[PDB]
Scaffold this active site. Structure first.
Site, mmCIF file in Angstrom:
data_model
loop_
_atom_site.group_PDB
_atom_site.id
_atom_site.type_symbol
_atom_site.label_atom_id
_atom_site.label_comp_id
_atom_site.label_asym_id
_atom_site.label_seq_id
_atom_site.Cartn_x
_atom_site.Cartn_y
_atom_site.Cartn_z
ATOM 1 N N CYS A 152 0.446 2.254 6.146
ATOM 2 C CA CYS A 152 0.106 2.067 7.552
ATOM 3 C C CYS A 152 0.745 3.131 8.435
ATOM 4 C CB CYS A 152 0.517 0.670 8.015
ATOM 5 S SG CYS A 152 2.205 0.192 7.596
ATOM 6 N N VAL A 156 -1.417 5.241 11.093
ATOM 7 C CA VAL A 156 -1.140 5.213 12.527
ATOM 8 C C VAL A 156 -0.862 6.618 13.045
ATOM 9 C CG1 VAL A 156 0.517 4.435 14.251
ATOM 10 C CG2 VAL A 156 -0.409 2.812 12.599
HETATM 11 S S1 CLF Z 1 8.290 1.134 4.412
HETATM 12 FE FE1 CLF Z 1 9.022 -1.005 4.624
HETATM 13 S S2 CLF Z 1 7.603 -2.126 3.294
HETATM 14 FE FE2 CLF Z 1 6.560 -0.179 3.764
HETATM 15 S S3 CLF Z 1 4.939 -0.605 5.599
HETATM 16 FE FE3 CLF Z 1 7.099 0.307 6.159
HETATM 17 S S4 CLF Z 1 8.376 -1.502 6.761
HETATM 18 FE FE4 CLF Z 1 6.691 -2.153 5.378
HETATM 19 FE FE5 CLF Z 1 3.697 -3.884 4.423
HETATM 20 S S5 CLF Z 1 1.787 -3.348 5.497
HETATM 21 FE FE6 CLF Z 1 1.530 -2.384 3.419
HETATM 22 S S6 CLF Z 1 3.620 -2.606 2.532
HETATM 23 FE FE7 CLF Z 1 3.606 -0.594 3.677
HETATM 24 S S7 CLF Z 1 1.387 -0.112 3.803
HETATM 25 FE FE8 CLF Z 1 1.313 -1.106 5.893
#
Ligand code: CLF
Ligand code: ICS
Ligand code: CLF
Ligand SMILES: [Fe+3]
Ligand SMILES: [Fe+3]
Lengths: 522, 477, 522, 477
Positions: A152, A156
């Site tokens: 994500c 973004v």
């Molecule tokens: S480094 Fe840590 S775990 Fe990674 S996103 Fe960032 S806070 Fe979360 Fe949750 S939703 Fe899926 S896993 Fe990521 S790609 Fe978008």
């Protein structure tokens, strides 16, 4: 204290009197806990219908969801190709979580890499991360292919995967001939099955879009099989076995069956089996393409029909009795091969088991959840068995799928008391099973807590959970099961009838109270 | 021993990297020298990972939500953002607690805002306020709310601090905003730091003017123990038997009231220095509370820590400490007599996050068991300073080791057992090397204290000497 | 009273208040029942070690046996041949009971006839009964072969089967060329497996004894397989599959899998599949004969070595890793075929499952019972998994088999606390599991009552039952499972580890009491 | 229907038999004419089976031990002989009881002498005495012992009566020797007769001189109800609602004290005439107790039986009977309204043992279902005398039918539903015809009375109209 001859783990070590006194002292002294009567009152309130009405008015809060994000499905799809490294452009925590999830469900090694984007990439993008990560991965783990998805953060920020990979190729970080398919997999759109669909479409477009001049439909006399997001090895195995029995040439794309079931013989295999690049390149020459899970393969369907010029059949997931028959007859029509006697005998044996277990299966009430195609196939099979689906939940479902499931339910008298819920989570389902109690639940491991809650209301209110779906974390080797075809129907029916009989045996084990119905023969 | 071939192995493993990756990775592998107390000149840690090398590290959200804030049972933690992060981290860590889940305890539950495309484009502050409203409606017995930010929250410009302030003023409720976006830092360590800062800024000073709590000279607070499989309970029973009153527990089986009462204790007993040194130093500076590190892994470390802790109090505490040691001596002596003959001489390679790679060495040595290689995912240089003297001479040290590096090191060294995480367990089981999960205790435990030592020894014996390890080669092969 | 919307069967209808009052009045008025305190005291006494000492002094009373009589095994053996009618010379109640037993186990039709000997034959013999029965059976059911066993009545009155059948042929009741093999199966000797052995020896002697002049060992390049008394269809299937993968020519003698698994497609098939008469005639021309269950195929071994001159290998039952490996290696050595890669990968996958589940499997205590070969294979596999067998019971075992099992136990440190019992019944095992509590039982459906008794002592004293063996009446379609080979080992391992996990989940479902250890991931 | 085609079908089926078998079997198949009162002119029963024709009949041991003596809960029944007979009959019949198994109840247990070769050669009377001593030692709360003889006991020169007499005198316990060897008779009917004679000779007359029991003018005893699935219980609650007192029921959930108290009742209500008419007539001759048959299958039969029973007592009993009928009228009316539309017009074939082939016709007709064929395994000519009047015109009757005969009859008639035992269930399920087990109620029930009628209707609806029966043909064939 511990006895050296009988060492106790946390349970039941913490049931000792000293630990009980310690915990009571802690709670009474410093936890400032609410009184137990207030806790019981609040729990009873949460079991009521007024709480259910409040719960179903939620608009912003999601409690215990039943879905994942797209890059997980993208990685699962990428793992199905020969010597292919899943490569997620973005943050490394996502890769750690993906690998832990798949490791816990499959109890197998899962290989996936991240380019470890940080705040510097949040400012200037991750082009340098892409170049260095591709070079490092190719040099170290030596894959034949690198399949790139996104987190994500990259979505973004707006990183251009195509331009980044092209610039990596131009500057010599990787050879120009090295295959690097890519797909945008935003986590705020859809779910993991959507990521699987996006990754498969990206790989297919990479391998076939620019080489359609010499492609003739039906040249190789094969049928393409796209399984979709699949977490049962037995499903791949049964599809291949059924197609081999019919003598039908087939090409199964994104086959992760080998790499998820490597033997323990003293060596570690990063790569095992998988769909080859030659098969992907020769796919447009097939007679047709069959999508096993059409309700999350829509983009793939559009690409296959618009580019490969294949007339993709309108087929449901081959689950249960009727839909397996329809899949078999459609494959026979496409390939020209008659259905052999062995498959007919297998279908007859399935019908025999259904007749054997119909008395115990009739009228049982079920609350089920999972992915759309699996959920609708399971509902169809339950209707075929005379069971009564009550609460049908699909967090990643849509309105058209809901209309199709309602049409399926209308065709059966046993679907009269069934309601389909889309966009609801497992807290909604907890309210539903408290207010309209079914006999059983069917779902993944997350349902176990719900069972606990039901048992807290009373033994007469407990709703047992049957573990079919993804992910299953509290049982071993259930990922080897089958849910497709006659074999999958046999396994599902056996599981259901034996769960019913086990519950019946448990409820009638009280000596001189209920054991009058503790029959040897059932 | 034989340092020279170890350096040769390091060079051989490194020769396959690209030039920049090899140059960076050369600094993170080292040969132990126990005389060295300055690990900066020998090893380099706390740096960003090389892209595409299959690191084991997590993110700051895992360090804050999954490690620090999550164990707090009476608070509700909202994973602010898309659905993935809280779903992958739901009930994955065995931080044990006592409560009624869904009514007054919410540890194993996953609360999320479930960001969609419209939330990304137009922000999620109003959605956050509505979520807080619904949380208040549906969970009336919650005693506080934390909001753990995920990556798009920091990327799109959401101001969760103002929402938290306004809603907390409106509801008279504690709402803690934590900016633990996963792209911050290089590992879970910055998540630890951010969570500690949030605790300091929003929770710790709430009872500074309150003096209704009766205080005793024997008040201590356990800091940095997360009750993995009941570890904190097994430590607390020993502390209570010695005569101290444990007011607070950070943060396994912890409550917000305990955190608020922490500034009233006489001593802080820090188990995990890596995750809680920030708040320990802040409490020492602001309230004058002394803190000390202790180790309850194995009988030797446990006895040493108990004696050192008793040395901070009067003579009755020391007498009770001697009584506890005498009472528990026969049990761990029997455990030693049962299991050491089965484990003596075996060599172990460890790779855990930031505390346990050096803390569990004493328990292993208590069973006649030698550690030949150790490493950290996210430790700092002070952790390596502490680790240098606890490891044997010419033993291998690795920081942020890659999968290929660790596989090659294990192939050459051939340890009898490996203790690492879930992402290496099956890799090394398929190679025929016994493996123990040293994060979740392989769904066993606890391992802390005298009660935990028996479980530890039994688990090591059951995995090391299992018959299955003698069957990997087919008789006809 | 009954509500038309929610109709209740006996459970829980008889838990209604009016039925409870009626039963209380009945008991207090006319049953003259002992006081409940006396009943509790007597039950507690029956759970003690002194009661166990009294129980094991039994010499003339048998309570809840774990064996059947020979003609049942003879009928099962006869069912494995093509178009063969089992014919039991004696009384018809025996055949009714045999058919009901096999119907309840397999949930399939079982065909078997009797000559219905009555009080008249008790002083004249059943010669006329045999003549008329043979004629009627051949005319009505049109079998290609009639396999004759005996009940205890004909054994006591000493009917001569050979003379009776020869006279039936002589007076034209049935044609002289019609194959009518026979065997004496006394119910007061051995058990059902002995009946299987006797019937198979009789059939083989009928088809091969008088035509051994033209036979040459190894001329047909095949391996004979004798499975013995087997009630799992998956075992026949896996033996055939493993022999086919090796590319080894084989002849499975007494194969009943087809007749016991006929499809439900609108017609009833009395006969299906089975060993042909040509295969039985050509059996002496094989390279060698392999006995799958040597401990109840002694007479068959004597006939095969003495007459066919086959050098029968000293092989254990192909259960578990080591014995499956030995069976495969012996088959490879006899046939000259190398072991293929697929079987090696399957073995590695089984080893991987063992490594994955070893932590939960280690140290668990099991009380198990069944037939000798199956019991010893299960004990071997339990020792391979690091489990501790504690109570090993075999009602139809002998002293030599007990010595072999003791030798197997002595070779493993996990068999240190194991005791082997021969000639003991399930009341003895109930005493043993009360006085020396294991973690689980492994056995047939008759174990369920024992579990109930344990639950009557307390939840902390309950010993759950795992249903492996014969017969299984209270579960559906478990007869389709496999216990032989790597596939059978995988199934057994999955069942054991998941039974342990369900027990742990049940023990830790108590809210705020034990649910601190209700882990999502195990 | 159309009698001549039924006779043609009978002839076509009989065409396959040899001369002797066909001559014998022609007498056991008939076309029903309701005007005929003497069934001996059309059908013959209670004869030996033709060898090798795959009959369904059992033996006398099944009739005595499995049917009559087995349901007695406070008595221990020893299957004297080899191991097979007791093992195949253990817990195969759902005669329900209330008790603590192994302490004061022993219904589902299997006691046997387990004869070996030495027992056959030298007899087993000494073994019987030793077994009785062992039973006394290990089961002190038993209130009696019965010894059920198997075939070798009759064949060899064993004298169990003298052993029973000696041991009963020695231990002051009732020991009942039953000579129910399987080669006696032709079916279970002789087992019924032998068991009744044993009950009369050894148990019934114990309290002839006892007058301590307080008797009422409303004392009745249920005879020939074995509590299949609780059937007897479902009957009893009605009879007690009518104001009567049920002292005993034979023999489901029965106790030896109830049997001994039976000669003190005012009226005997016999459900199974076939198995208990002997003891009912003996009680009538010796004690002057009148007995009457009744039917509790279906609302119509239940109401008729209740009124007939009430007619034997005073006005208050009749008024209570009317109250019970009024109370239960809406429930069975609702059951009929719900289930008759789905079952109206269907055709049923039955083949059961001695009583049910005619007893459940009324229940089927109450659901608008019509019986086309019926038959008995072991009934006598009086049973067929009742059946001919109970059955419809031009319907088929069969006595001791063979598997081939029944298969051909079902193939020609093509009924909608078949009710028979476990040995035809799967044969007819594979044929695509719904099947209901009419012995064990398909592990459901009870079916007696108003409560049982709802379960009966639900079961017939669920089996007849199951979707599985529409899927036997593959779409491509
Ligand atoms: S480094 Fe840590 S775990 Fe990674 S996103 Fe960032 S806070 Fe979360 Fe949750 S939703 Fe899926 S896993 Fe990521 S790609 Fe978008
Ligand atoms: S006793 Fe008889 S065969 Fe009257 S031996 Fe049989 S429990 Fe049948 S038709 Mo099984 S004369 Fe009872 C009977 Fe009827 S066992 Fe039951 S159902 S009403
Ligand atoms: S007609 Fe009836 S059931 Fe038959 S024997 Fe006779 S009493 Fe008994 Fe038990 S042991 Fe086996 S089954 Fe028989 S052959 Fe010897
Ligand atoms: Fe694995
Ligand atoms: Fe069947």
């Amino acid at each position: 204290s511990q006895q050296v001859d009988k060492i106790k783990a946390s349970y039941p070590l913490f049931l000792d009197q000293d630990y009980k006194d310690m915990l009571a002292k802690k709670r009474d002294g410093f936890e400032e806990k609410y009184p137990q009567d207030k806790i019981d009152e609040v729990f009873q309130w949460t079991t009521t219908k007024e709480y259910q009405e409040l719960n179903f008015q939620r608009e912003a809060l999601t409690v215990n969801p039943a879905k994942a994000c797209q890059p997980l499905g993208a990685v699962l799809c990428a793992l199905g190709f020969e010597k292919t490294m899943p490569y997620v452009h973005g943050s490394q925590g996502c890769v750690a979580y993906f690998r832990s999830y798949f490791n816990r469900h499959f109890r197998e090694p899962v290989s996936c890499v991240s380019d470890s984007m940080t705040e510097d990439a949040a400012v200037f993008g991750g082009q340098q991360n892409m170049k260095d990560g591709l070079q490092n991965c190719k040099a170290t783990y030596k894959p034949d292919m690198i399949a790139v998805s996104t987190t994500c953060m990259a979505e973004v920020i707006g990183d251009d995967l195509n331009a980044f990979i092209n610039n990596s190729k131009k500057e010599g970080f990787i050879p120009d001939e090295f295959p690097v398919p890519f797909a945008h997999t935003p986590s705020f759109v859809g779910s993991h099955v959507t990521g699987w669909d996006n990754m498969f479409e990206g790989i297919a477009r990479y391998f076939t879009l620019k080489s359609m001049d010499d492609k003739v439909v039906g040249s190789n006399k094969k049928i393409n099989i796209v399984p979709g997001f699949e977490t049962y090895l037995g499903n791949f195995r049964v599809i291949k076995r059924m197609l081999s029995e019919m003598g039908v040439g087939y090409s199964l794309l994104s086959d992760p069956e080998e790499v998820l079931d490597t033997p323990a013989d003293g060596q570690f295999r990063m790569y095992a089996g998988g769909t080859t690049q030659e098969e992907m390149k020769d796919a447009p020459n097939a007679l047709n393409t069959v999508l096993l899970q059409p309700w999350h393969l829509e983009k793939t369907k559009k690409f296959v029909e618009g580019t490969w010029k294949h007339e993709v059949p309108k087929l449901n997931i081959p689950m249960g009795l009727d839909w397996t028959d329809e899949f078999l007859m459609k494959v026979s029509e496409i390939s020209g091969q008659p259905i052999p006697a062995s498959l007919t005998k297998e279908r007859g044996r399935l019908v025999d088991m259904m007749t054997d277990s119909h008395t115990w299966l009739h009228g049982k009430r079920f609350a089920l959840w999972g992915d759309p195609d699996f959920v609708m196939g399971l509902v169809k099979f339950l209707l075929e068995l005379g069971c009564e689906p009550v609460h049908i939940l699909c967090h990643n479902g849509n309105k058209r799928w809901k209309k199709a499931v309602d049409a399926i339910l209308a065709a059966s008298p046993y679907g009269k008391n069934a309601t389909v819920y889309i966009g609801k989570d497992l807290w909604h389902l907890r309210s539903l099973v408290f207010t309209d109690k079914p006999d059983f639940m069917i779902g993944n491991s997350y349902g176990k807590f719900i069972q606990r809650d039901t048992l807290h209301k009373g033994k007469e209110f407990e709703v047992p959970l049957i573990r079919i779906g993804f992910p299953i974390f509290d049982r071993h080797h259930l990922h080897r099961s089958t849910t497709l075809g006659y074999e999958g129907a046999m396994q599902i029916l056996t599981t259901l009838v034996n769960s019913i009989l086990e519950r019946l045996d448990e409820e009638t084990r009280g000596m001189q109270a209920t054991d009058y119905n503790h029959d040897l023969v059932r | 021993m034989s340092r020279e071939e170890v350096e040769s192995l390091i060079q051989e493993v490194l020769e396959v990297y690209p030039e920049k990756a090899r140059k960076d990775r050369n600094k993170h592998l080292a040969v132990n020298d126990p005389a060295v107390t300055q690990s900066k000149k020998c090893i380099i840690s706390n740096k960003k990972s090389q892209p595409g090398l299959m690191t084991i590290r997590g993110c700051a959200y895992a360090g804050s939500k999954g490690v620090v804030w999550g164990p707090i049972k009476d608070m509700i933690h909202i994973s602010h953002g898309p659905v993935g992060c809280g779903q992958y981290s739901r009930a994955g860590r065995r931080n044990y607690y006592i409560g009624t889940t869904g009514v007054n305890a919410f540890v194993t539950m996953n609360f999320t805002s479930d960001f969609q495309e419209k939330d990304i484009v137009f922000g999620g502050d109003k959605k956050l306020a509505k979520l807080i409203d619904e949380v208040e409606t549906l969970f009336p017995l919650n005693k506080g709310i934390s909001v753990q930010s995920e990556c798009p929250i920091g990327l799109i410009g959401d101001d969760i601090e103002s929402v938290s302030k306004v809603k907390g003023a409106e509801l008279s409720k504690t709402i803690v905003p934590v900016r633990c976006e996963g792209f911050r830092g290089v590992s879970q360590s910055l998540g630890h730091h951010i969570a500690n800062d949030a605790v300091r800024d929003w929770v710790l000073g709430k009872r500074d003017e309150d003096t209704t709590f009766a205080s005793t000279p024997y008040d201590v607070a356990i800091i940095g123990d997360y009750n993995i499989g009941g570890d904190a309970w097994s430590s607390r029973i020993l502390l209570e038997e010695m005569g101290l009153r444990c007011v607070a527990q950070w943060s396994g089986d912890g409550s917000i009231s305990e955190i608020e009462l922490t500034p009233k204790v006489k001593l802080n007993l820090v188990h995990c220095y890596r995750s809680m040194n920030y708040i320990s130093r802040h409490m020492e500076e602001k309230y004058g509370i002394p803190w000390m590190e202790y180790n309850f892994f194995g009988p030797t470390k446990t006895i040493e820590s108990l004696r050192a802790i008793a040395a901070k109090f009067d003579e009755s505490i020391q007498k009770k400490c001697e009584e506890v040691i005498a009472k528990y001596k026969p049990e761990w002596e029997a455990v030693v007599a049962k299991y050491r003959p089965r484990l003596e001489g075996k060599r172990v390679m460890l790779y855990i996050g930031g505390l346990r790679p050096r803390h569990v060495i004493g328990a292993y040595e208590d069973l006649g068991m030698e550690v030949v290689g150790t490493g950290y995912e996210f430790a700092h240089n002070d952790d390596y300073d502490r680790t240098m003297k606890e490891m044997g001479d010419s033993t291998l040290l690795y920081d942020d080791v890659t999968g290929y590096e660790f596989e090659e090191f294990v192939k050459r060294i051939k340890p009898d057992l490996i203790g690492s995480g879930i992402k290496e367990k099956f890799i090394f089981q398929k190679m025929g090397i016994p493996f123990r999960e040293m994060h979740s205790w392989d769904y066993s435990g606890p391992y802390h204290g005298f009660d935990g030592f028996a479980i530890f020894a039994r688990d090591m014996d059951m995995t090391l000497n299992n018959p299955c390890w003698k069957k990997l080669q087919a008789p006809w092969e």
